[PDB]
Amino acid sequence: DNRINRIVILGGGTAGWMTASYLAKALGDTVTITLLEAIGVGEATVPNLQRVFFDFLGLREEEWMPECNAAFKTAVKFINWRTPGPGEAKARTIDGRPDHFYHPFGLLPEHGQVPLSHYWAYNRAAGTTDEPFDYACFAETAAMDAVRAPKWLDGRPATRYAWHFDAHLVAEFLRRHATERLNVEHVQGEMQQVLRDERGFITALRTVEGRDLEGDLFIDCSGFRGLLINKAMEEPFIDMNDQLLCNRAVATAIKHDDDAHGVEPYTSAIAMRSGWSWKIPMLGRFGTGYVYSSRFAEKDEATLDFCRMWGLDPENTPLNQVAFRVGRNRRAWVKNCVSIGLASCFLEPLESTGIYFITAAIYQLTQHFPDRTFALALSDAFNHEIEAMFDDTRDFIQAHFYVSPRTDTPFWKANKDLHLPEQMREKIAMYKAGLPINAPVTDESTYYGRFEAEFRNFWTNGSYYCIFAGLGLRPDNPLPMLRHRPEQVREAQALFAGVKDKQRELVETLPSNLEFLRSLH
Numbered sequence: 101d102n103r104i105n106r107i108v109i110l111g112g113g114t115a116g117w118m119t120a121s122y123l124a125k126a127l128g129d130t131v132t133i134t135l136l137e138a139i140g141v142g143e144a145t146v147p148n149l150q151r152v153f154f155d156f157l158g159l160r161e162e163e164w165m166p167e168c169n170a171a172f173k174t175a176v177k178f179i180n181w182r183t184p185g186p187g188e189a190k191a192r193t194i195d196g197r198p199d200h201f202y203h204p205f206g207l208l209p210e211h212g213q214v215p216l217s218h219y220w221a222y223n224r225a226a227g228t229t230d231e232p233f234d235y236a237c238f239a240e241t242a243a244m245d246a247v248r249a250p251k252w253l254d255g256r257p258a259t260r261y262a263w264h265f266d267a268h269l270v271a272e273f274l275r276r277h278a279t280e281r282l283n284v285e286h287v288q289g290e291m292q293q294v295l296r297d298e299r300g301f302i303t304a305l306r307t308v309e310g311r312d313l314e315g316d317l318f319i320d321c322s323g324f325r326g327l328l329i330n331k332a333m334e335e336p337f338i339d340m341n342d343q344l345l346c347n348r349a350v351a352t353a354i355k356h357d358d359d360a361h362g363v364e365p366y367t368s369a370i371a372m373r374s375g376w377s378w379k380i381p382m383l384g385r386f387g388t389g390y391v392y393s394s395r396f397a398e399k400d401e402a403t404l405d406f407c408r409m410w411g412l413d414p415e416n417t418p419l420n421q422v423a424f425r426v427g428r429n430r431r432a433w434v435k436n437c438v439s440i441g442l443a444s445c446f447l448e449p450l451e452s453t454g455i456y457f458i459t460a461a462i463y464q465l466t467q468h469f470p471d472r473t474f475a476l477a478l479s480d481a482f483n484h485e486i487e488a489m490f491d492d493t494r495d496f497i498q499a500h501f502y503v504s505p506r507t508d509t510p511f512w513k514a515n516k517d518l519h520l521p522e523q524m525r526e527k528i529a530m531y532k533a534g535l536p537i538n539a540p541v542t543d544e545s546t547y548y549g550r551f552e553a554e555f556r557n558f559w560t561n562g563s564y565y566c567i568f569a570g571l572g573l574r575p576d577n578p579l580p581m582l583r584h585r586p587e588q589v590r591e592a593q594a595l596f597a598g599v600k601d602k603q604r605e606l607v608e609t610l611p612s613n614l615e616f617l618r619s620l621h
Contacts, residue, residue: 111322118462436474498515537564
């Protein structure tokens, strides 16, 4: 009888209560689960969260969204990544158009086995259109400019979407679900010491009241502190500040008159002088944070730059000042200790992958769930999947800064001097030669429906084009085979006319994001 019988989770934030909720639903009566628990600036997500996590618990969006002031996200909107200037909230003007581009969630249609992105690049090369990639290929762009909801009020779906929420209210919601419905034991207090047997395996966590929380498997959700994985288990952290220079944030939440200009159904990533600022809008308020590099901006500099952009009084404003730890553990799972969330790895939230890394770790844990013999092949496989997923998004995020044309400050210039990973250099070369990068091979509903489908190809061709083309990088030439298929090019133009029809229709019939939020809340 080598089954795990007891699980102890250290940490009672989002990662802790997502882990406890999911594991308890997954394991039921067979395992005892105990969690040891010692301003809201907003959090954004990616579309698989409902299918991977909340659907597993049986929680419909109509249930959990009103419990955490959740709102909708159709894309990340990148503002001022091509033009020089101060950290400012509204886009600058680059050659007649605002300097912004969208990174939405919808998959690009194909025609003749070629993605719509490549017909756009063909038309641009031919000089017949000047339209930006995102507005030519994505119907969602017109809906976001008109601050539309992603659904009609009665639930009729319209566009692929994810969520904005206050992460603390989500954790409180999941704590109530886990403890009242899934028989998870909540234990207040601080950890006194970590008990370890003669082979380095954790046997129990001892609270400051002298209680020993014994278990066979231990989940470290203690945040940056990494109390089990880094302190007790002594697993080293791999600092990756040599690739991503931002290491600090100053953040707050701002009350907002939604009746003036609505609630933006997207996250904004606003380029600053020494980093970038997020904007996460919800009903009645938005969360915002300047993510910056202490190697290029002083603390007061960033604080004041951040407050100046939003018109905040710096002397009379509550501000979260946090330094963060960019990288991942050498191994996410060591012996019988699994790190999840900030205790495992962290990247700046430029593409909203934080919650995704948590649900991914939790899903992969159940996919590689151990017994008390703790076969190394299980944790080795787990660690490889975590390492591959993190490094792939790390590289993706770095390309956001590397491909930006900005050189006006030392921060934006120093990004272009960093070592570009060989796999990303190859990707830029394929892109310049007109090839698709990681073209999707499944349909959209399956893509966000099967975890392992998205997990293997997390950043697809549409996403690379959103970033590269949005930042001003186009192929050296269109895909060469298209020169041999002129009838396909002529046929594919009906797809662009279809997007334009859908842009008009979505703007003219969808309700406002504000209207839906008030209906929901």
